[PDB]
Design a protein around this motif. Structure first.
Motif, PDB file in Angstrom:
ATOM      1  N   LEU A   1       0.834  -1.193   0.000  1.00  0.00           N
ATOM      2  CA  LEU A   1       0.000   0.000   0.000  1.00  0.00           C
ATOM      3  C   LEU A   1       0.872   1.247   0.000  1.00  0.00           C
ATOM      4  O   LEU A   1       1.877   1.313   0.713  1.00  0.00           O
ATOM      5  CB  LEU A   1      -0.929   0.001   1.220  1.00  0.00           C
ATOM      6  CG  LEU A   1      -2.122   0.951   1.228  1.00  0.00           C
ATOM      7  CD1 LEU A   1      -3.159   0.486   0.227  1.00  0.00           C
ATOM      8  CD2 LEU A   1      -2.727   1.012   2.617  1.00  0.00           C
ATOM      9  N   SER A   2       0.480   2.238  -0.802  1.00  0.00           N
ATOM     10  CA  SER A   2       1.225   3.483  -0.877  1.00  0.00           C
ATOM     11  C   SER A   2       1.071   4.273   0.423  1.00  0.00           C
ATOM     12  O   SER A   2       0.060   4.153   1.120  1.00  0.00           O
ATOM     13  CB  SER A   2       0.756   4.313  -2.071  1.00  0.00           C
ATOM     14  OG  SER A   2       0.752   3.539  -3.258  1.00  0.00           O
TER      15      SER A   2
ATOM     16  N   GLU B   1      -2.516   6.762   1.233  1.00  0.00           N
ATOM     17  CA  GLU B   1      -3.692   6.034   1.686  1.00  0.00           C
ATOM     18  C   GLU B   1      -3.355   5.063   2.808  1.00  0.00           C
ATOM     19  O   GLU B   1      -4.263   4.619   3.513  1.00  0.00           O
ATOM     20  CB  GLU B   1      -4.367   5.306   0.521  1.00  0.00           C
ATOM     21  CG  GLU B   1      -3.739   3.987   0.119  1.00  0.00           C
ATOM     22  CD  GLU B   1      -2.454   4.140  -0.666  1.00  0.00           C
ATOM     23  OE1 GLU B   1      -1.856   5.234  -0.644  1.00  0.00           O
ATOM     24  OE2 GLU B   1      -2.045   3.153  -1.313  1.00  0.00           O
TER      25      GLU B   1
ATOM     26  N   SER C   1     -10.619   9.489  -5.395  1.00  0.00           N
ATOM     27  CA  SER C   1      -9.705   8.584  -6.087  1.00  0.00           C
ATOM     28  C   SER C   1      -9.030   7.637  -5.102  1.00  0.00           C
ATOM     29  O   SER C   1      -8.848   6.444  -5.392  1.00  0.00           O
ATOM     30  CB  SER C   1      -8.662   9.378  -6.871  1.00  0.00           C
ATOM     31  OG  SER C   1      -8.247  10.522  -6.149  1.00  0.00           O
ATOM     32  N   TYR C   2      -8.652   8.154  -3.931  1.00  0.00           N
ATOM     33  CA  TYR C   2      -8.066   7.318  -2.890  1.00  0.00           C
ATOM     34  C   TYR C   2      -8.993   6.162  -2.545  1.00  0.00           C
ATOM     35  O   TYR C   2      -8.664   4.989  -2.778  1.00  0.00           O
ATOM     36  CB  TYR C   2      -7.764   8.161  -1.651  1.00  0.00           C
TER      37      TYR C   2
ATOM     38  N   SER D   1     -11.297   5.014  -4.051  1.00  0.00           N
ATOM     39  CA  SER D   1     -11.434   4.128  -5.202  1.00  0.00           C
ATOM     40  C   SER D   1     -10.325   3.079  -5.230  1.00  0.00           C
ATOM     41  O   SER D   1     -10.594   1.887  -5.440  1.00  0.00           O
ATOM     42  CB  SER D   1     -11.440   4.943  -6.493  1.00  0.00           C
ATOM     43  OG  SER D   1     -10.133   5.366  -6.834  1.00  0.00           O
ATOM     44  N   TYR D   2      -9.066   3.499  -5.040  1.00  0.00           N
ATOM     45  CA  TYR D   2      -7.997   2.497  -5.038  1.00  0.00           C
ATOM     46  C   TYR D   2      -8.143   1.521  -3.876  1.00  0.00           C
ATOM     47  O   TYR D   2      -7.954   0.311  -4.055  1.00  0.00           O
ATOM     48  CB  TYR D   2      -6.583   3.099  -5.040  1.00  0.00           C
ATOM     49  CG  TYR D   2      -6.363   4.457  -5.659  1.00  0.00           C
ATOM     50  CD1 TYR D   2      -6.273   4.597  -7.035  1.00  0.00           C
ATOM     51  CD2 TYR D   2      -6.079   5.563  -4.875  1.00  0.00           C
ATOM     52  CE1 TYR D   2      -6.027   5.825  -7.618  1.00  0.00           C
ATOM     53  CE2 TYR D   2      -5.826   6.801  -5.447  1.00  0.00           C
ATOM     54  CZ  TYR D   2      -5.801   6.924  -6.819  1.00  0.00           C
ATOM     55  OH  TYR D   2      -5.545   8.148  -7.394  1.00  0.00           O
ATOM     56  N   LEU D   3      -8.480   2.011  -2.679  1.00  0.00           N
ATOM     57  CA  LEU D   3      -8.732   1.055  -1.598  1.00  0.00           C
ATOM     58  C   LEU D   3      -9.870   0.103  -1.949  1.00  0.00           C
ATOM     59  O   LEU D   3      -9.747  -1.111  -1.751  1.00  0.00           O
ATOM     60  CB  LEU D   3      -9.000   1.728  -0.247  1.00  0.00           C
ATOM     61  CG  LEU D   3      -8.061   2.708   0.476  1.00  0.00           C
ATOM     62  CD1 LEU D   3      -6.674   2.081   0.609  1.00  0.00           C
ATOM     63  CD2 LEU D   3      -7.977   4.102  -0.085  1.00  0.00           C
ATOM     64  N   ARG D   4     -10.970   0.622  -2.501  1.00  0.00           N
ATOM     65  CA  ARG D   4     -12.091  -0.230  -2.880  1.00  0.00           C
ATOM     66  C   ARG D   4     -11.638  -1.350  -3.802  1.00  0.00           C
ATOM     67  O   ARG D   4     -11.936  -2.525  -3.562  1.00  0.00           O
ATOM     68  CB  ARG D   4     -13.181   0.611  -3.548  1.00  0.00           C
ATOM     69  CG  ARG D   4     -14.231  -0.195  -4.313  1.00  0.00           C
ATOM     70  CD  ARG D   4     -14.920  -1.237  -3.435  1.00  0.00           C
ATOM     71  NE  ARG D   4     -15.581  -2.270  -4.226  1.00  0.00           N
ATOM     72  CZ  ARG D   4     -14.965  -3.305  -4.781  1.00  0.00           C
ATOM     73  NH1 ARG D   4     -13.664  -3.495  -4.638  1.00  0.00           N
ATOM     74  NH2 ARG D   4     -15.673  -4.175  -5.495  1.00  0.00           N
ATOM     75  N   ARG D   5     -10.903  -1.010  -4.862  1.00  0.00           N
ATOM     76  CA  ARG D   5     -10.462  -2.071  -5.761  1.00  0.00           C
ATOM     77  C   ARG D   5      -9.416  -2.973  -5.121  1.00  0.00           C
ATOM     78  O   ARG D   5      -9.234  -4.106  -5.580  1.00  0.00           O
ATOM     79  CB  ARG D   5      -9.901  -1.519  -7.073  1.00  0.00           C
ATOM     80  CG  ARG D   5      -9.008  -0.307  -6.956  1.00  0.00           C
ATOM     81  CD  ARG D   5      -8.746   0.282  -8.331  1.00  0.00           C
ATOM     82  NE  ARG D   5      -8.476   1.713  -8.292  1.00  0.00           N
ATOM     83  CZ  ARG D   5      -9.405   2.651  -8.418  1.00  0.00           C
ATOM     84  NH1 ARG D   5     -10.681   2.341  -8.572  1.00  0.00           N
ATOM     85  NH2 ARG D   5      -9.042   3.929  -8.397  1.00  0.00           N
ATOM     86  N   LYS D   6      -8.724  -2.509  -4.080  1.00  0.00           N
ATOM     87  CA  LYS D   6      -7.599  -3.283  -3.570  1.00  0.00           C
ATOM     88  C   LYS D   6      -7.961  -4.243  -2.442  1.00  0.00           C
ATOM     89  O   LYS D   6      -7.588  -5.419  -2.513  1.00  0.00           O
ATOM     90  CB  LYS D   6      -6.485  -2.339  -3.114  1.00  0.00           C
ATOM     91  CG  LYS D   6      -5.273  -3.050  -2.545  1.00  0.00           C
ATOM     92  CD  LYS D   6      -4.261  -2.054  -2.019  1.00  0.00           C
ATOM     93  CE  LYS D   6      -3.174  -1.799  -3.054  1.00  0.00           C
ATOM     94  NZ  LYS D   6      -2.011  -1.063  -2.491  1.00  0.00           N
TER      95      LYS D   6
ATOM     96  N   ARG E   1     -18.751  -3.221  -0.333  1.00  0.00           N
ATOM     97  CA  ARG E   1     -17.484  -2.984   0.338  1.00  0.00           C
ATOM     98  C   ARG E   1     -17.714  -2.702   1.817  1.00  0.00           C
ATOM     99  O   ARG E   1     -18.756  -2.174   2.212  1.00  0.00           O
ATOM    100  CB  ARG E   1     -16.731  -1.815  -0.307  1.00  0.00           C
ATOM    101  CG  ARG E   1     -17.262  -0.442   0.069  1.00  0.00           C
ATOM    102  CD  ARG E   1     -17.425   0.461  -1.145  1.00  0.00           C
ATOM    103  NE  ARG E   1     -18.214  -0.165  -2.198  1.00  0.00           N
ATOM    104  CZ  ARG E   1     -19.532  -0.304  -2.164  1.00  0.00           C
ATOM    105  NH1 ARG E   1     -20.247   0.135  -1.140  1.00  0.00           N
ATOM    106  NH2 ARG E   1     -20.150  -0.896  -3.182  1.00  0.00           N
TER     107      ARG E   1
END
Lengths: 50, 99, 99, 99, 99
Positions: free
Chosen positions: D26-27, D30, D68-69, D71-76, D83
């Motif tokens: 994880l970056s 986030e 957008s953040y 969103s990346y957590l959701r997909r990850k 969710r």
């Protein structure tokens, strides 16, 4: 001014460092008799201070 | 009770030094330095820690005194360019018998 | 007292290091950095906190000096590209066993 | 002191995260956001205060960064469309489990 | 910090409700309406004041929006025609225990 800034020598530097004489103000306040009392004092140190 | 390391020998009863028992003396400052060295044999001796313990704490001078002292020690006992007490820059010296 | 992690070994009594069975030479700077890394095994290290702790506070230069030092440590002990010392972009470095 | 919710797990020391014990990288941005929502679990969190706290006060332009953040957590971290990090439009997001 | 009114349960910390044993979802504006009603439970609220407290001060629209919102409430909180949340023509809205 610090006495060392006067470009002095080994014995005078050691004497001022071990004992703790830092500025020429205390030297101009102290007379020749009051400065020659120190043991193992150098004749070259006396001459240069004079 | 004598502090020894291979050839180095030091006594605290008569205060004499030996390098495998050969004629050798030592002036008091370097003698105390070697006493601290043998009492800390195998342990690093940094310039600050030697100037604290083996050198009196009132020292307002510069570090090069200990460098001159260690040069005296080298030229006295560790005469060869490759020595038994080895120097680490910035970290002082330590007893590392050459392999 | 002597610190270790998998293969790395470190003794602070005489300041020596070990990378899987040999003595490796290291300057005092990177020695202090690896030491600070091994005290926090399991903890990630960030460039600000390391420059505060192991480096002086009034260091006026650029951070990239620690980048050079950590690169040297990588080419020192983590010879392969796979590494014990792991990078985290924008965060810093950690010292865990490679997976 | 390690922080978890349901099965997602996080360490504040090694900064490793477990998706029910599964690995994930994880970056840092986030990452701190996620650490936030774990530390104040039980509370809904909205973009004004997100970009106020976890982002610098100087950021006065775009707002869709946190969308957008999330969103990346959701997909990850969640394979299902439903969710765990639920979204309440206009009041931000919250971290729950399906009832 | 919790909010209660008989069979009405509201927690604003994580924005959730329970009616008679079943959590439900709701829009943010109508949720704020319900929050205002339950904090001012037992007191009559005029529609001017209701709008000034829940919606925008500069809201230049009509007044039927609050009627639509309260209808959306009523189709979610009280099934019976006799009404826990009551209306006073010309005075506004109120929340009571049915008598």
């Amino acid at each position: 001014l610090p006495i060392d800034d006067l470009d002095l020598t080994v014995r005078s530097y050691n004497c001022l460092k071990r004992e703790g004489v830092h500025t020429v103000g205390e030297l101009v306040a102290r007379t020749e008799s009051d400065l020659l009392d120190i043991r193992n004092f150098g004749q070259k140190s006396i001459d240069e201070v004079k | 009770v004598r502090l020894t390391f291979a050839d180095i020998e030091l006594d605290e009863e008569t205060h004499e030094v030996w390098k495998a028992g050969q004629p050798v003396s030592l002036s008091p400052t370097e003698f105390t330095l070697l006493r601290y060295f043998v009492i800390n044999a195998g342990t690093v001796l940094s310039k600050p820690k030697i100037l604290d313990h083996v050198w009196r704490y009132d020292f307002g001078g510069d570090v090069n005194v200990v460098e001159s002292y260690v040069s005296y020690l080298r030229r006295k006992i560790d005469t060869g360019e490759k020595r038994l007490l080895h120097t680490l820059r910035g970290v002082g010296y330590v007893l590392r018998e050459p392999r």
